[PDB]
Amino acid sequence: TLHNIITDTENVQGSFSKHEFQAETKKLLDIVARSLYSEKEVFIRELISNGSDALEKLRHRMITTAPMEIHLQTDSVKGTFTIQDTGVGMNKEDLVSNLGTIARSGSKAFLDSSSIIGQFGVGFYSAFMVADKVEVYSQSAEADAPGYKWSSDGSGVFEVAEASGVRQGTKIVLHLKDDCKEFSSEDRVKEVVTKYSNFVSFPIFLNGRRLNTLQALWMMEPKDISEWQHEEFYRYVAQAYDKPRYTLHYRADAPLNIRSIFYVPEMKPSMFDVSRSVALYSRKILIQDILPKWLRFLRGVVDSEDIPLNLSRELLQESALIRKLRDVLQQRVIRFLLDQSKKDPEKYARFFEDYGLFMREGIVTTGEQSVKEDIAKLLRFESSALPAGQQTSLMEYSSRMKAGTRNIYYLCAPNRHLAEHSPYFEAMKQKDMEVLFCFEQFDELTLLHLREFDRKKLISAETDIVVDHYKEEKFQDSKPASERLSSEQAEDLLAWMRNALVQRVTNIKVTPRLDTHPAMITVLEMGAARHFLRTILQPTLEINTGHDLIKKLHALKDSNPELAQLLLEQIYDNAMIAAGLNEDPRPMISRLNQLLTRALE
Amino acid sequence: TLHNIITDTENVQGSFSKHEFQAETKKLLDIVARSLYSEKEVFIRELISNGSDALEKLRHRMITAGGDAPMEIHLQTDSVKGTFTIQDTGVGMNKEDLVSNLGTIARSGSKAFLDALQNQAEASSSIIGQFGVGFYSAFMVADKVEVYSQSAEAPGYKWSSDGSGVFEVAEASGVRQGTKIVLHLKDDCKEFSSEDRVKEVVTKYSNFVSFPIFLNGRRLNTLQALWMMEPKDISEWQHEEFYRYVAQAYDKPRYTLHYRADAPLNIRSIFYVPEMKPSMFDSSVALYSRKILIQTKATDILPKWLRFLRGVVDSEDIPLNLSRELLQESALIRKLRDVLQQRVIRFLLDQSKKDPEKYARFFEDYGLFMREGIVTTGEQSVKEDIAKLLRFESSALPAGQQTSLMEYSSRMKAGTRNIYYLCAPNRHLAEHSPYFEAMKQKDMEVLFCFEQFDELTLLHLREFDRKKLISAERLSSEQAEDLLAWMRNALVQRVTNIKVTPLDTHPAMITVLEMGAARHFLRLQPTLEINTGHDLIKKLHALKDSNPELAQLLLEQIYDNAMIAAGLNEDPRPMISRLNQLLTRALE
Numbered sequence A: 001t002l003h004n005i006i007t008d009t010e011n012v013q014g015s016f017s018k019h020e021f022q023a024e025t026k027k028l029l030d031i032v033a034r035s036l037y038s039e040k041e042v043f044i045r046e047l048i049s050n051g052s053d054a055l056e057k058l059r060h061r062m063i064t065t066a067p068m069e070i071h072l073q074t075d076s077v078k079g080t081f082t083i084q085d086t087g088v089g090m091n092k093e094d095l096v097s098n099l100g101t102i103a104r105s106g107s108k109a110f111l112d113s114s115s116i117i118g119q120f121g122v123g124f125y126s127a128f129m130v131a132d133k134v135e136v137y138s139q140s141a142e143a144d145a146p147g148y149k150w151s152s153d154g155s156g157v158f159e160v161a162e163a164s165g166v167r168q169g170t171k172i173v174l175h176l177k178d179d180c181k182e183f184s185s186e187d188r189v190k191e192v193v194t195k196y197s198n199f200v201s202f203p204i205f206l207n208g209r210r211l212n213t214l215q216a217l218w219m220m221e222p223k224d225i226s227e228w229q230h231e232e233f234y235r236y237v238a239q240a241y242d243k244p245r246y247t248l249h250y251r252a253d254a255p256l257n258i259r260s261i262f263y264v265p266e267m268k269p270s271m272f273d274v275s276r277s278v279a280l281y282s283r284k285i286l287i288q289d290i291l292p293k294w295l296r297f298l299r300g301v302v303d304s305e306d307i308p309l310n311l312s313r314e315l316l317q318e319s320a321l322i323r324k325l326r327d328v329l330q331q332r333v334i335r336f337l338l339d340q341s342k343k344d345p346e347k348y349a350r351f352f353e354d355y356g357l358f359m360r361e362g363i364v365t366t367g368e369q370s371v372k373e374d375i376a377k378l379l380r381f382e383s384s385a386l387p388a389g390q391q392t393s394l395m396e397y398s399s400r401m402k403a404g405t406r407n408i409y410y411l412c413a414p415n416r417h418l419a420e421h422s423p424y425f426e427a428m429k430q431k432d433m434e435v436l437f438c439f440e441q442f443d444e445l446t447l448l449h450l451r452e453f454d455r456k457k458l459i460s461a462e463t464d465i466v467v468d469h470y471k472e473e474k475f476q477d478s479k480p481a482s483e484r485l486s487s488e489q490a491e492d493l494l495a496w497m498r499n500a501l502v503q504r505v506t507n508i509k510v511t512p513r514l515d516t517h518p519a520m521i522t523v524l525e526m527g528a529a530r531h532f533l534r535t536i537l538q539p540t541l542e543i544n545t546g547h548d549l550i551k552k553l554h555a556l557k558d559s560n561p562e563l564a565q566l567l568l569e570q571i572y573d574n575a576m577i578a579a580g581l582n583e584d585p586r587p588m589i590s591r592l593n594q595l596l597t598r599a600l601e
Numbered sequence B: 001t002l003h004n005i006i007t008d009t010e011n012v013q014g015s016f017s018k019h020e021f022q023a024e025t026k027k028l029l030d031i032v033a034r035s036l037y038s039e040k041e042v043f044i045r046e047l048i049s050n051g052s053d054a055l056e057k058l059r060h061r062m063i064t065a066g067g068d069a070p071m072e073i074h075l076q077t078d079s080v081k082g083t084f085t086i087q088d089t090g091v092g093m094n095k096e097d098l099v100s101n102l103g104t105i106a107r108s109g110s111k112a113f114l115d116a117l118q119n120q121a122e123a124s125s126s127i128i129g130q131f132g133v134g135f136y137s138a139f140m141v142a143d144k145v146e147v148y149s150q151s152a153e154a155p156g157y158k159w160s161s162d163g164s165g166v167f168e169v170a171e172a173s174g175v176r177q178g179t180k181i182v183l184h185l186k187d188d189c190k191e192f193s194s195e196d197r198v199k200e201v202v203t204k205y206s207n208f209v210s211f212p213i214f215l216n217g218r219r220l221n222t223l224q225a226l227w228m229m230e231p232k233d234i235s236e237w238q239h240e241e242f243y244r245y246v247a248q249a250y251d252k253p254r255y256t257l258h259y260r261a262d263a264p265l266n267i268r269s270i271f272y273v274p275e276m277k278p279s280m281f282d283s284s285v286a287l288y289s290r291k292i293l294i295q296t297k298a299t300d301i302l303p304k305w306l307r308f309l310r311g312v313v314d315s316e317d318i319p320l321n322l323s324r325e326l327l328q329e330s331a332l333i334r335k336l337r338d339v340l341q342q343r344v345i346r347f348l349l350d351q352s353k354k355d356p357e358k359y360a361r362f363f364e365d366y367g368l369f370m371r372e373g374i375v376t377t378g379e380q381s382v383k384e385d386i387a388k389l390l391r392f393e394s395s396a397l398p399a400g401q402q403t404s405l406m407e408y409s410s411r412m413k414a415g416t417r418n419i420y421y422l423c424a425p426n427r428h429l430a431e432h433s434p435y436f437e438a439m440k441q442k443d444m445e446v447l448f449c450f451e452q453f454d455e456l457t458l459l460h461l462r463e464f465d466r467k468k469l470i471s472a473e474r475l476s477s478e479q480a481e482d483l484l485a486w487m488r489n490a491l492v493q494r495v496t497n498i499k500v501t502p503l504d505t506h507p508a509m510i511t512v513l514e515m516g517a518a519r520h521f522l523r524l525q526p527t528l529e530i531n532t533g534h535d536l537i538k539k540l541h542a543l544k545d546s547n548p549e550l551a552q553l554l555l556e557q558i559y560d561n562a563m564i565a566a567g568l569n570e571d572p573r574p575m576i577s578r579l580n581q582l583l584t585r586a587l588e
């Protein structure tokens, strides 16, 4: 039933020769020269980092004064790019060993702490991506020491000749290939520097003008950072013009090394961009997610020494590692935002109004219940048990629940007045249960997807009203029996209503649970029905036979049957609208206007 | 104010010593084994590609040599010994080729094979190898690697290594024709001795390899690379299944474009538009090369506004990064993106002609991508290309039915200059804008733009057909004034202007002077026009002194009813309790 050819059959005959791996060096030069990096411009990053390492080796050994800097020059007329550092330089033996041997890194034999970038022994060859000729002039300290010129066309061979007039350090001239002349442009070179080499530890000069390198804030001690320094750094990393309303400066060492800053912009998010975020670093140079999708409103920077880098310094090398980093950051950001709620609830209300949509998206799109509930801790509602305007949370609702209660009741309505006076809340007031009031458009969807919180099932007031019909409906009316239609009158009214609304409602019943309102529409899965109307069901019309409008309808059906029918139709429509289950309300206006005149004689 | 230290001061004195570039072979094995790829699992992709190439070389030998011999790649896991084994029945390797091909970094037997083929030999486009390093990915995951190989000529051989500097070679019996590679997995890579883990990697990268792949005796890669076949020989059901696979979807493609071409690059591609519609509560076009996955999410081959497309792009000659997971920057790849943009745009315009019904549903669903594209590009010729897909409503024909900018440019007074538009919430608010009647005197036809972001789409557009887009932004004589003057006093906050106009069935309506101030009343300056013949307004005139409580309930309702008729209030829940009062008081 199976097809296999792999069998343990092989056996060694006789002896074995030992061999050493070799290398096809001409082809290796070519691989590094056109196949290693996806973007040609990174030769600038590679040569600058070598210059920084040379300056580090000099700074380290001179403890044990001279200037320590990196100079760039563009000559568009001669088509050349030049970088010179004032670092340790190289002697002749160093030039042929380090530049001559691919994968040889002097900067790795240097130990035996943390400023060095070099390791792979290949970065220098990236110049041959953009140059058909490379000259190096280098001068060691002290040491012997003559000056040397190293020269190569990049494919095969190089030459080393003694030289005079070589300044302490190293100068590299690239005679640019004809299709790489952009790198003889000052603006072009400047933009590559600030992209990749913007936090280098030594001054960089481009054509005699010093460049505005920055401090790597994320690596520094958090209360050595003023608010003003965060405003400026935020504007740089977010390329923004405003300022951050929150700043989270997050360092960790276990389980992962993490050095990170996150900002929430003062600006409200663009709605065009929400439907249309953080830079990743190591050793202060860039890597080409890190955050769950719902936290993409965050700006800032993340740096982690546990992210291994591929040879090219643009791929990150362990995806499960990245899910772990993502999950650590997500929990830390949730903890931060909860803390902001405690510190300053009014400012958090503003933040929740501007960014809450991201919390809702996060809850709806996660599959992990514990993650859903963690994000849900950020949500804010009002409550029937609190004064109007006062914001509360799911956890505060949980803590007020009596020892016996098993469910969290909520009511979705456009504003505080409507929830407080909803027919659905009037029905719930008969019970002894707090009711969360939720005013935002996608609140109900969110709670439906959340489903439970702290092992307590979420139940909307509308749903709960229907489930009571199938329990011991032990509810008493708000007006005494004198003030309601008699049973004979109700049943006569209901039989008339069923005939007049025959192809619209599944059933029509009297309810003891309304006071202000004449009627309500009920649907077991009310929240799902509201959402499904996102461009016919089994709705029940429940009537308050103590309401003056219902009592009048019962009279109109015999005193003016046609006026009663227009009125019945409008009561149904009003209840549908109150239920949030109404289609386009415009065609109702004619009947209402026709009803209004007829009612007003 | 300058400070530059770069000066022409060096002069060569002495002679040249000429040297050859070399390589530090041990550290290079470490790099090419561990620091190349973004995932350890790629070693399976690499060894399967090598096996495929071995099989392709054997098939090519048999055109002239005509040997036989099943052509298969077999994988075997062993979770007790912690090993992963791959065996192919291809050309194998004699002792010379083992030492040369395995023993030398960057040495590629398959590249030399390719370089010696006739131009149009079928194997020229199927051989994956190139860089000479892929095999070393085994040492990412393996403490020890053993290769048993038998060539198709004349003795079997065993190549062995721990990855550090050196390897051994010995004669071996009894090796089957071809090559068997045994990986002794590192402890922290034991997962690749799990059958289910290996299956995941095979399907991820190697699902379309041209030769049957078996795992522990059972066949895997059952999918065929539709994008390589003749567009005619593919039926609609095959596209539906391939779409569902490649997009990880459960619906159907509403549109299918199967595009093949040969310059600027060899391209074999299928693009699909889903039938279902995106929501904020939530793949991409994959890039392939020679039937191997390069990127599940192809980055730079399509403009970002075409990211709603799903499907596959395969190129035999696209310049690949050493990792085989990225493209090198390339004028050819920039030119391909421009080519694909034009091709897709043309396919969509054709669909609009073949089926305006279908295309209208499509624009409703995906027009945000067309608008985003016109906004975010910086080339005017492209903006007018994407704009050919835009649809709007127009004054010149009724609701629901749509027209293109080319259709508008068609019907214009002989020698008309500008294209005229008005971005508004809806048709009713547009037909009553103080700025619409003015242009109903000049250039009669004006485009009505109800959609979100229509405004900045046309502003960022700025010029289509080299023509400029530009916006623009009964009852007695005076017993009506008695009622009209009484009205502002009871609505001092909301409306400001309350006129009187001839409406028929409606007592009042709402009009707005600027759709900019009305479009974000919906996230106000309303005018309340009134017909004095309506029986609710002659009624309102009466009760204001009769039943003044009833007369304001009636007033709020006429206002709210008018706001609903104008689409400025679409959720009337706040009125309902009051309306119920009005109704209860009107009925006595």
Ligand SMILES: Nc1ncnc2c1ncn2[C@@H]1O[C@H](COP(=O)(O)OP(=O)(O)O)[C@@H](O)[C@H]1O
Pocket: A050, A051, A054, A085, A087, A088, A089, A090, A098, A099, A103, A104, A105, A106, A107, A108, A117, A118, A119, A120, A121, A122, A123, A124, A125, A169, A170
């Ligand atoms: N500007 C420089 N000044 C001094 N030494 C340098 C310079 N650039 C390169 N080197 C030496 O040459 C070596 C080879 O560099 P490279 O091939 O780029 O690999 P890596 O940067 O990983 O060391 C470096 O390790 C360093 O020892």
Ligand SMILES: Nc1ncnc2c1ncn2[C@@H]1O[C@H](COP(=O)(O)OP(=O)(O)O)[C@@H](O)[C@H]1O
Pocket: B046, B050, B051, B054, B088, B090, B091, B092, B093, B101, B102, B107, B108, B109, B110, B111, B128, B129, B130, B131, B132, B133, B134, B135, B136, B178, B179
């Ligand atoms: N399974 C195999 N059967 C026969 N030859 C192989 C096999 N695997 C590798 N080779 C040979 O060894 C060479 C080196 O393989 P590799 O280092 O992966 O580089 P590439 O595939 O880019 O050539 C290949 O070109 C091919 O000649």
